[PDB]
Design a protein around this ligand. Sequence first.
Ligand SMILES: O=C(O)[C@@](O)(COP(=O)(O)O)[C@H](O)[C@H](O)COP(=O)(O)O
Ligand SMILES: O=C(O)[C@@](O)(COP(=O)(O)O)[C@H](O)[C@H](O)COP(=O)(O)O
Ligand SMILES: O=C(O)[C@@](O)(COP(=O)(O)O)[C@H](O)[C@H](O)COP(=O)(O)O
Ligand SMILES: [Mg+2]
Ligand SMILES: [Mg+2]
Ligand SMILES: [Mg+2]
Ligand SMILES: [Mg+2]
Lengths: 356, 230, 467, 465, 140
Amino acid sequence: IVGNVFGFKALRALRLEDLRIPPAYVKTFVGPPHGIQVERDKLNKYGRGLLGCTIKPKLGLSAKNYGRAVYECLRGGLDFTKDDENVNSQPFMRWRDRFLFVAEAIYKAQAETGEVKGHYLNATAGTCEEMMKRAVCAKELGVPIIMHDYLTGGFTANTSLAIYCRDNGLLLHIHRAMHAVIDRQRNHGIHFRVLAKALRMSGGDHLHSGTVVGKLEGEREVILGFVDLMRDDYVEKDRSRGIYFTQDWCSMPGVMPVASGGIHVWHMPALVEIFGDDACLQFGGGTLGHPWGNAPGAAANRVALEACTQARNEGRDLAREGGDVIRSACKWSPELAAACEVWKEIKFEFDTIDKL
Amino acid sequence: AGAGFKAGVKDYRLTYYTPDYVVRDTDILAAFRMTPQPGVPPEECGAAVAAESSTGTWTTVWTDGLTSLDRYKGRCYDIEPVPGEDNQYIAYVAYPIDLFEEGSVTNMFTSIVGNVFGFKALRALRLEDLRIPPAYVKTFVGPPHGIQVERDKLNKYGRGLLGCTIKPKLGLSAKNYGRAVYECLRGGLDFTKDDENVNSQPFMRWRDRFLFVAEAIYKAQAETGEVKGH
Amino acid sequence: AGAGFKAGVKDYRLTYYTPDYVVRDTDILAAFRMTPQPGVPPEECGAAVAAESSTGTWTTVWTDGLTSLDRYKGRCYDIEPVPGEDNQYIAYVAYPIDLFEEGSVTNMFTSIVGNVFGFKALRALRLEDLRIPPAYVKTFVGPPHGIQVERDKLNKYGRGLLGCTIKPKLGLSAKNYGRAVYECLRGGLDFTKDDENVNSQPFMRWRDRFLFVAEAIYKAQAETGEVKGHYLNATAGTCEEMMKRAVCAKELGVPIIMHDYLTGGFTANTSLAIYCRDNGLLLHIHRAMHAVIDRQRNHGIHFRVLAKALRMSGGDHLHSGTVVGKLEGEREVILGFVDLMRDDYVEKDRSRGIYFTQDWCSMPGVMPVASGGIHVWHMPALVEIFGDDACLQFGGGTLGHPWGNAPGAAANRVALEACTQARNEGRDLAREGGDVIRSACKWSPELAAACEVWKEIKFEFDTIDKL
Amino acid sequence: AGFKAGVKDYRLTYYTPDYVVRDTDILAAFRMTPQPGVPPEECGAAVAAESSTGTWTTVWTDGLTSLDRYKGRCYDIEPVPGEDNQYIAYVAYPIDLFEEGSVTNMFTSIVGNVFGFKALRALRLEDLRIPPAYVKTFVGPPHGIQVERDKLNKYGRGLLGCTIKPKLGLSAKNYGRAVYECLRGGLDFTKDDENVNSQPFMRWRDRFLFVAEAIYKAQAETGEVKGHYLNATAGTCEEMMKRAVCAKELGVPIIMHDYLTGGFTANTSLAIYCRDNGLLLHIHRAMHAVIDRQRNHGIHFRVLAKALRMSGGDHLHSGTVVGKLEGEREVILGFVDLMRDDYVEKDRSRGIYFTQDWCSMPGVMPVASGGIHVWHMPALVEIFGDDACLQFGGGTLGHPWGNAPGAAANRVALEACTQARNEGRDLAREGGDVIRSACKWSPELAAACEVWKEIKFEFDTIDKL
Amino acid sequence: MMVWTPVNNKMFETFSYLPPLTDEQIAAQVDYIVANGWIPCLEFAEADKAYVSNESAIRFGSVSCLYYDNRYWTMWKLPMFGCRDPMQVLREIVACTKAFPDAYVRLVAFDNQKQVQIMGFLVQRPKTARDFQPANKRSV
Ligand SMILES: O=C(O)[C@@](O)(COP(=O)(O)O)[C@H](O)[C@H](O)COP(=O)(O)O
Ligand SMILES: O=C(O)[C@@](O)(COP(=O)(O)O)[C@H](O)[C@H](O)COP(=O)(O)O
Ligand SMILES: O=C(O)[C@@](O)(COP(=O)(O)O)[C@H](O)[C@H](O)COP(=O)(O)O
Ligand SMILES: [Mg+2]
Ligand SMILES: [Mg+2]
Ligand SMILES: [Mg+2]
Ligand SMILES: [Mg+2]
């Protein structure tokens, strides 16, 4: 479908907007190792969005400091932390050292909080053999979840990893590194909704979906469209959300959308309103940038999420009362109040390139 | 008191724009064709690209203090205006060799082109070129054989090689594929090939093709006396 | 007609002595201490060494014309006379990076030290230093963990590590080995170790030892609340046996194994180092046999090169010498290669025997191990010489304590901590060292007993391996 | 006898001049140079102690075992004639000290730490007596001289080899081109240079394949069995084994290993592989002269040769006497016997310090290599006899007419000398005549004779007895 | 001959074999941290989380080599980046130990160039601890 035709002299630009994948073809795929329902069931987590956090700085931390930051994040109320997409194995921190210290951190935070914890250990590697070695170590450590950069690693490797995860009971978080090289411009490339469908087929339990309100681009109506394509069994044609074809997934498990990138406590109401409960909300800078450290940063984000969730459940409209909900929480919680103070004025509002 | 942790957002350029930096011979260099949004200085845009493809995020993190950001940060060290363009710049970024996993193109792309192309603060971004230093080139196995060894194994010298993709792209049976392959090779072509999208499909399964193609290669080779491949 | 094939012998210097060559940053550089035979010009001798360690042989070969000798030849680019020597020269040779197999210390040695030391035209030859360029360093896996990662895994910070070789060297049963190990560890030592020659023997088979030692490590760790280890020796006759021993250590969940890298060899050592990386085992390296090669000033390979080679091949620890102990190694010489072992970047410094600036391009550092004929009185000197990033091993200095291993271990541990505390408070260990120890022997009965037994014991002899 | 803490002289425990050595003991002859003020007895006892059971201070744990049973013993000290401060110290080690089948372990004890002792100025291991009871624990050479000749179907003359040159820089295809041309002219073998492993200019598997084509071409052309020592020497055991496996899978006869730079652990592994898969193993001694060149310090090559015979190898480089690398005639004759023979009596005039009984361990073929050419042929045949490989790298690829004539010249010279010897001619006296008659008869040989007529390698010998 | 007791004689890494540090001795160590430009930090743990243990290894395959629980302790606030005042460190020791009177508390310092902990010693143990001997009752 996208092999040669984009390079033809006879056209000036070409963009693949959507694909109708028929049930008869969907059924040929193993698909996601677990999917939203199974993931919640294995983690024993229900009734709210999941909360995550990318460890920062992106690169340059030692394995011991990585586990240290992970323990402090998890113990404060985050469900997950994660390797940055580009944290693989490097002179400053070799993968197996990280995996071991992160395991210690997971199990310490889990024992301390009484809640199941995980950290997406990156299996992304130069070769399929190295990728598998890292998946195998995670299995042997008994940890819940690994991650893979499906576009930079590639579909062939990704599908292999997803099958391994299915056969070994690991959750698989998918990072979409490189997608915007392909999907940013309106006139040429492949729209992310197609890359999202491809991932659901190839296999992944989570996929990054954009934030609407954070540092990376993605319009509300566009994102709502493919979030349905990622999660739901049947999605009717709807051109106002960029859905060009009715898509029947024929019981293929849904993929959990991950909202990540330049988001903080003030975005919480909007995020809960956009995504609902079946999403993971990730706060890297929004946790490790808290003036009091990782644990209070985590607690601030957890409080904010639960306050919004409770408000929604009580019948409050987060779209108009969201501000009120957060302010009442910042007043109540000192951890939250510190976060609220720091990021109050911080917004990401620019002209949108990828319009419908 | 010296340099401590101050929470909050500051400009990327305060850390990641280093126009006086002298690049090291082990640095990976990148040339980005950058189109900033209105109101975003090119320096801040280049610095954002350098930051978010190396060590930095959108707000200050305390963990920086445990390591040496000077050692690890990507550095936008030069910005050139593009002749003919009102709002295009070439931003030059240097990345310390320590940032990269040895032998992994996957990792190199993940850093350099991973997230930065989707930033709201830019309208368009194009990676034009990379300077891969010898110290990083040496970590790669690289090509299985290369031009010289290929020519030596095939015993083919003094002219370009001749190939041919079998057509129609899809829809031929394995037997017909080998039939077409034999007829091409026997007439003077060095190689034939599967079309990019010929993998294994209901009209033609891969192992059936491989066997009939092997028959065809060997028949053409015996007939012509020249080494053939597909 | 241009340049063609002319059969016959010509001087090596016509091709391999290039005094105007500007070295490339990717070149491997060698500093050879060279003693030519009477009637052999230093230029011809250096060119010979360059030629016969790279591309050349004794007569002209026609096959040179099919390739580019300019591209591949080793080059003697400089010759320094040695001050104080009538017939000694430092010949500097540059080798193109293309000459070497990526990741293979074996191949590097095979070229550089393979045949040239036996040439009739020279009387003696010593390799003093190698400049390993980043572009070649980056081809090596290197040490399984390194100093930072080892400290982090062991949770040990703020002082030298303390070790101890079990004695007698040979002749103890597996059960008695584990018995001695437990009593050493429980008294305050971080590590004990198999002697270098303890592999598997009629008096004690290796797997029996590993099991009893595992029991000992876990007993001492439970008793003290500190992480303990024992370097279990994987050195063996074959790679297959070596690997079986490593695999058992892995399955016992113990922290650390050891290998004799020169007697086992670089091929086996690199294999073990990769295994340890992939399985999370620390790797202690013993330098058995090094002094066969590195003792004499006129011929062999200086230990600093053997140390660089180990850092490339892979090892978390490497023995460094003691200065003050029973085995030879001068202070300035040792301080030089300790920096080469531990640091990321080491500038040329001929007063410490460093002939080239060495950039390790973020390859992990190797922990130096001071071992051999040392006891409590040596402690201030050792701490002053090495600092915290070192393991100090006391074999006889623990098992020779009048009250047994646990008191022996506690004497050494008290002495180290007293010196570390004193240094931290701003006391000069080089002058006040004796005072620190005397104050400590007066406070600790264990330490007093050690101080009394070894008070007069020194090792002071004329140094052979002088700069 | 209780435990008494503290330092005492080594000689009190480890100097035993009345000890009668056991036939199972490993014996060592150390050329020892003590520091001023250290008695030879104390220095010999320190060497014995610190290479066996002892350390610098008395340890309580001795009492749990039997030091009498396990201790190494300095049992004899000879002064060295002509030396004021040199002694031969003889140490006996109980067989119980050593791991069966492990050259690595033997070296670790005997030469591990003692060479670095402050109390001595120099130390050289001159010889080892390896007793039958220890020899028998080793697999040893994959094949040995008799089986090698039998598999190659080559009898009645020295074998002829050649190292491809330049050492480095040739492409795989050009390597096989050179190899074919060498083999087809009359050489039995060619070889990778010791430092030819796998490099940017030539990757190993490419070389293995092109070399296989060359071997089989030259074999078909000449009707004689050919081989090329493909170098398995590598950075890791896993890489080494991959290269050996490819050789096996190509059906070629012979591989090589640099036993000292690769190491004994890897070497023993490779030799066992070769035994189990029927590959001949050529051993290159790269690095040996770092260890064995100086008279006052190191390990004499005769010991390194004994170690190789135990570790395993079908060929081992021995020296030439007359070529570019050092090695005295009487020294070389001594260890050639140690490499090839079943039983070699003590003979100090050839540097043999102990009678050595190999108890039917296969002999290793000596390889004479390095700066030799056609004029050396009579001397080589006279020194080594038939059971040797003579290698001519520069002496083949340096021939004015190319590799095949170069090979032909060497082969004619060898056969002429062999025939002359068989007819009763004395090669030591008539060698020059034999070669001159042959250069007159063979144009290939004449070209070689002309080019290298004046070329000799005559220098003062460092490693004197 | 004195016998080193195996009973209730648990140790605490660096300086645990010396007499307990006086306030003057603690202040001298803090001066050392500041004089060298290292980053002070405080860590604490409840008694059950103070010593190295193995419990998580129940979940493992054969991968327990150099894994232990209880190596990580809990960070008191943040590392004191840019701190050049010893009195500030001493005040944090007081504040930490006051908030957690029944916890083990250790003072550590980090080097950001080596990226490793460069020093560390215990500054408080709970008064209910009975698993350690005073210096004079370590051997009998
Ligand atoms: O590297 C980063 O920038 C992040 O770790 C976020 O860090 P912060 O939490 O500190 O912003 C994520 O990978 C991006 O959100 C990916 O973007 P997307 O989800 O759109 O693919
Ligand atoms: O076998 C020995 O003699 C030792 O166990 C020390 O015993 P003691 O502690 O009883 O002296 C060590 O292996 C040597 O120190 C090695 O020397 P180096 O460190 O120079 O390689
Ligand atoms: O590299 C070389 O110089 C050789 O290939 C000989 O080449 P030429 O035939 O051209 O001289 C041999 O490896 C040496 O003889 C080894 O020395 P030894 O046999 O003494 O170990
Ligand atoms: Mg990220
Ligand atoms: Mg095509
Ligand atoms: Mg020892
Ligand atoms: Mg050679």
